[PDB]
Amino acid sequence: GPKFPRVKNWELGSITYDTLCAQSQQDGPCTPRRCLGSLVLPRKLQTRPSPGPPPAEQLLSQARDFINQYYSSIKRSGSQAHEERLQEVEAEVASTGTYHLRESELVFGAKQAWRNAPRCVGRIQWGKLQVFDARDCSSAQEMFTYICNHIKYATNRGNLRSAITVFPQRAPGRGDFRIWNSQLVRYAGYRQQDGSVRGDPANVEITELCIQHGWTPGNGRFDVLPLLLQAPDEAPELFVLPPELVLEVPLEHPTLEWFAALGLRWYALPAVSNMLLEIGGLEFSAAPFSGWYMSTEIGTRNLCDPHRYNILEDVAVCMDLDTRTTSSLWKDKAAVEINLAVLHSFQLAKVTIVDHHAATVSFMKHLDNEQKARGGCPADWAWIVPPISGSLTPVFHQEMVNYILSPAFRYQPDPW
Amino acid sequence: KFPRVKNWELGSITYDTLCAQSQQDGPCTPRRCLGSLVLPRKLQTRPSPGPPPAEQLLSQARDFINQYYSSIKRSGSQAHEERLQEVEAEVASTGTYHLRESELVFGAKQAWRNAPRCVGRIQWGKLQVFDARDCSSAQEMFTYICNHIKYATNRGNLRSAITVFPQRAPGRGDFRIWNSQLVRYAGYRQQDGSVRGDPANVEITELCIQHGWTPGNGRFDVLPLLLQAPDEAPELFVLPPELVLEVPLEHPTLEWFAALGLRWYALPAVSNMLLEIGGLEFSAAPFSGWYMSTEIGTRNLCDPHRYNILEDVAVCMDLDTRTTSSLWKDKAAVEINLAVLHSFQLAKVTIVDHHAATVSFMKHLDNEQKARGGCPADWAWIVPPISGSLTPVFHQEMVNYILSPAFRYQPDPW
Ligand code: HEM
Numbered sequence: 084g085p086k087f088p089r090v091k092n093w094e095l096g097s098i099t100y101d102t103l104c105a106q107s108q109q110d111g112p113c114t115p116r117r118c119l120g121s122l123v124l125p126r127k128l129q130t131r132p133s134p135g136p137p138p139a140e141q142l143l144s145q146a147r148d149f150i151n152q153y154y155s156s157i158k159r160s161g162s163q164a165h166e167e168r169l170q171e172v173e174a175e176v177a178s179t180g181t182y183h184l185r186e187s188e189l190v191f192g193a194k195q196a197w198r199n200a201p202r203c204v205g206r207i208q209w210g211k212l213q214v215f216d217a218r219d220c221s222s223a224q225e226m227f228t229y230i231c232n233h234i235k236y237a238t239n240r241g242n243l244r245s246a247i248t249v250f251p252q253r254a255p256g257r258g259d260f261r262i263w264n265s266q267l268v269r270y271a272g273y274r275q276q277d278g279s280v281r282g283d284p285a286n287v288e289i290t291e292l293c294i295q296h297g298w299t300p301g302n303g304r305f306d307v308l309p310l311l312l313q314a315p316d317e318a319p320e321l322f323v324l325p326p327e328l329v330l331e332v333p334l335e336h337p338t339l340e341w342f343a344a345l346g347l348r349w350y351a352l353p354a355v356s357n358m359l360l361e362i363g364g365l366e367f368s369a370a371p372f373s374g375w376y377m378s379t380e381i382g383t384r385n386l387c388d389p390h391r392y393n394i395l396e397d398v399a400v401c402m403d404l405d406t407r408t409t410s411s412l413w414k415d416k417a418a419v420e421i422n423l424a425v426l427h428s429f430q431l432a433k434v435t436i437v438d439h440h441a442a443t444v445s446f447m448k449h450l451d452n453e454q455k456a457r458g459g460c461p462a463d464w465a466w467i468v469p470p471i472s473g474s475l476t477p478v479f480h481q482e483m484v485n486y487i488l489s490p491a492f493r494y495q496p497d498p499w
Numbered sequence: 500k501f502p503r504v505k506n507w508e509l510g511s512i513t514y515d516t517l518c519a520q521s522q523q524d525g526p527c528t529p530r531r532c533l534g535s536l537v538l539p540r541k542l543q544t545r546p547s548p549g550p551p552p553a554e555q556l557l558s559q560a561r562d563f564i565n566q567y568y569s570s571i572k573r574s575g576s577q578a579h580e581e582r583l584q585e586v587e588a589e590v591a592s593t594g595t596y597h598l599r600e601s602e603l604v605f606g607a608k609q610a611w612r613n614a615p616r617c618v619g620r621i622q623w624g625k626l627q628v629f630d631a632r633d634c635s636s637a638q639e640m641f642t643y644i645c646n647h648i649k650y651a652t653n654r655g656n657l658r659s660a661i662t663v664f665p666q667r668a669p670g671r672g673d674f675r676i677w678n679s680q681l682v683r684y685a686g687y688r689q690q691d692g693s694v695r696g697d698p699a700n701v702e703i704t705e706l707c708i709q710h711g712w713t714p715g716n717g718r719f720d721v722l723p724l725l726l727q728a729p730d731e732a733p734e735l736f737v738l739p740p741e742l743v744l745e746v747p748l749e750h751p752t753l754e755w756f757a758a759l760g761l762r763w764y765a766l767p768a769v770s771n772m773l774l775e776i777g778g779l780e781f782s783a784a785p786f787s788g789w790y791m792s793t794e795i796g797t798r799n800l801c802d803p804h805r806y807n808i809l810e811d812v813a814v815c816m817d818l819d820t821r822t823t824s825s826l827w828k829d830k831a832a833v834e835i836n837l838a839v840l841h842s843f844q845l846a847k848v849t850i851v852d853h854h855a856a857t858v859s860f861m862k863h864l865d866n867e868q869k870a871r872g873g874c875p876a877d878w879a880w881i882v883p884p885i886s887g888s889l890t891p892v893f894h895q896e897m898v899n900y901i902l903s904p905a906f907r908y909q910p911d912p913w
């Protein structure tokens with residue numbers, strides 16, 4: 084039939100064709116010889132640092148393309164405003180080598196970048212995003228206020244609201260605005276004498292960076308790390324977040340009275356801060372965004388992963404399961420109760436969270452919406468399916484096509 | 500060129516150089532990845548309008564022969580050079596050639612080894628290859644199939660085996676087993692759009708009745724075989740009940756579980772895939788080993804479009820089916836997978852849980868890293884349907900490609 088990828092849902096037997104991928108202008112890791120689609124960081128979703136400004140011709144084509152998407156989103160394609168804005172963009176690039184976005188253009192691109200994110204299962208909310216323009220920001224101290232305002236608005240005392248704060252874009256012949264941290268709120272990871280790690284092993288390097296930068300450490304599993312904010316050409320400055328600004332949730336179990344005694348907990352606000360936001364060829368090296376958590380990110384990955392908190396065995400012992408044999412499914416049983424504890428704790432603390440069932444069910448609805456809207460939806464299957472109960476969720480049985488659309492959230496090298 | 504692969508749990512890194520030997524193409528391109536698709540019309544070995552080009556068959560054959568003589572270390576000897584001569588001579592004159600029993604045995608083991616969607620590949624060298632190329636009727640196929648079943652089953656101590664029927668010929672129809680597996684349960688489409696039995700087997704159950712089978716009305720009725728000899732109508736053959744070992748499901752602690760009447764067969768034997776060795780294609784080559792517990796407890800019994808028992812079990816467990824946040828599905832699922840493992844263990848029938856299986860797969864990836872420089876794996880198929888991150892494969896980046904010999908998908912004969 085049609086010349087586009089055929090996609091099937093094995094649960095419903097329904098078929099769809101992805102015409103949207105034809106719009107992709109950025110290559111992926113795969114080739115007809117082999118699939119590199121399971122790699123987290125292939126050198127195809129990562130934007131290396133441009134020490135030199137992008138070739139004026141390449142920037143122009145990305146700019147022209149973005150503007151067209153903008154005017155198209157407002158239904159004025161081919162209009163005088165459209166042709167004038169295009170003229171104004173190449174004019175800017177002509178004399179300055181770069182250009183700047185209008186306010187409403189930034190809002191559009193940021194929402195599109197999220198909408199374009201293949202690894203996000205929460206894209207059904209893509210239209211509801213608070214874009215805080217912080218392109219005026221000129222100091223590391225100002226970055227702190229902006230971030231503090233972001234956390235305040237986004238947190239909204241448990242009734243979380245999606246938001247992003249965009250700092251000045253990459254300017255040739257000038258340093259980047261970078262947030263050294265991976266997320267705004269992160270737990271410290273202390274490298275012990277015996278080699279082990281107290282806290283979160285994932286955050287070991289940054290913790291050692293904060294220390295080297297004057298931070299006076301603690302010695303707990305759940306210590307919130309300070310921010311390491313960097314303004315153009317200046318070394319990073321350290322800023323400590325006010326405790327009242329960081330909402331956390333103490334984990335307890337609905338029935339297992341002893342779970343509370345484990346002293347486990349997690350922060351309520353997930354805010355990625357190390358990713359690059361690329362819009363029309365313009366790069367925004369510092370542009371933290373946040374929304375809310377899906378229960379499995381905390382209860383399964385953060386808490387149960389071998390290279391993270393690794394609490395599966397401890398909880399199994401407390402549940403008195405045969406941890407000596409795999410066929411007892413002690414890992415499956417503890418993980419279930421751990422995920423249930425996260426849900427219960429967040430629901431009790433009136434903080435926003437969504438479980439993996441509801442989450443994926445809403446993504447399917449997002450998929451139908453997008454099929455009608457753009458004729459497809461770029462999705463990364465491995466990241467869309469939850470880390471537990473995979474086939475129990477509707478997305479498992481949904482084939483998916485993955486490709487890179489712009490605007491987009493890309494990975495970038497560490498500033499150090 | 501060579502993909503850098505990484506294990507996020509151990510921080511280890513490896514470079515896959517085995518993918519360079521891939522000659523067959525997948526569905527992916529630089530524009531978009533199609534790796535999550537079960538069967539693109541591409542890889543599929545569909546029928547043809549004549550004899551393959553001799554240039555290609557010859558090169559696919561020479562490569563395979565080179566592979567075989569390399570396996571037995573005689574790479575270069577006279578036996579190698581003469582086997583190549585024999586193949587060149589036969590392809591040139593007949594437009595085809597035939598394999599020796601030893602080579603076929605090597606090929607079948609190398610097909611399994613090359614299977615990207617197989618998690619049990621650590622058992623790859625342990626395979627009983629029954630040569631059935633001297634078969635000329637559906638009736639003979641049946642006898643061969645029963646022999647395979649009785650061997651593989653082995654009173655519960657399952658053994659991996661494969662029966663290879665006559666290859667495909669440019670001048671005639673194919674030898675085919677219409678069923679997707681030798682043992683399957685019937686799916687009868689009831690009046691109200693409903694489905695009694697296994698829904699995934701509705702079409703094949705219908706075909707059996709079209710060809711004169713007297714059906715039942717149980718949720719677990721074993722289907723008869725539809726074996727097809729070249730250019731002939733398929734024939735119906737009912738498997739002897741004593742040959743088909745089935746396991747009644749019960750829970751170690753939940754007494755009411757047994758009362759649900761659930762049960763599952765012991766032998767998982769795929770009969771609809773095509774085995775390709777050195778350019779030759781074997782359209783009927785059923786293979787079997789043993790189940791990984793998730794295949795039955797999660798997929799077969801819990802998939803929405805299968806037996807879909809999730810809710811019923813939850814109700815029996817008296818769980819909160821009102822909200823998704825009570826994780827009732829996850830809870831019911833775990834007990835079902837537990838009942839399966841307990842049942843196959845109680846019945847002295849070979850089974851492997853996903854934790855055990857995936858750990859052995861990690862070991863296998865390692866053996867293969869030193870052996871061939873890599874290992875084709877389909878991450879989506881390797882990672883179990885439940886508790887994915889709880890297993891080591893989840894944290895392992897994988898490279899997927901097509902190596903030959905290979906098990907490929909093929910059209911339905913009807
Ligand atoms: C509103 C609720 C949202 C939910 C529940 C949600 C959920 C998720 C989940 C489960 C992941 C997987 C992360 C992992 O496994 O490590 C993810 C990834 C992602 N989300 Fe969303 N998301 C939401 C909001 C947002 C917002 C507001 C943005 C951007 C404006 C966004 C951008 C992304 C991106 C780019 C990724 C990919 C991260 C990566 O490549 O590592 N998400 N999201």
Ligand code: HEM
Pocket residue numbers: 607611614616617618619620622626659660661769772786787788789790791794851856880906
């Ligand atoms: C030793 C016991 C074995 C175990 C535990 C095992 C397990 C598995 C599992 C779990 C799958 C995925 C099935 C699915 O999701 O539907 C699979 C697929 C596969 N296995 Fe293995 N396997 C074993 C033996 C074999 C043998 C003996 C062969 C062939 C000689 C083989 C060839 C394959 C092939 C070709 C597939 C792909 C099937 C498809 O595409 O539908 N396996 N195996």
Ligand SMILES: CN(C)C(=N)NCCC[C@H](N)C(=O)O
Pocket residue numbers: 266353354355372373374375376377380381385
């Ligand atoms: C609102 N966003 C972006 C998210 N829900 N998740 C982003 C990654 C969070 C990470 N898995 C974590 O658990 O920290």
Ligand SMILES: CN(C)C(=N)NCCC[C@H](N)C(=O)O
Pocket residue numbers: 767768769786787788789790791794795798799
């Ligand atoms: C011995 N082989 C290859 C297997 N273990 N499985 C093949 C597929 C069986 C199917 N998932 C089923 O549930 O019947």
Ligand SMILES: [Zn+2]
Pocket residue numbers: 113117118119120527531532533534
């Ligand atoms: Zn791919």
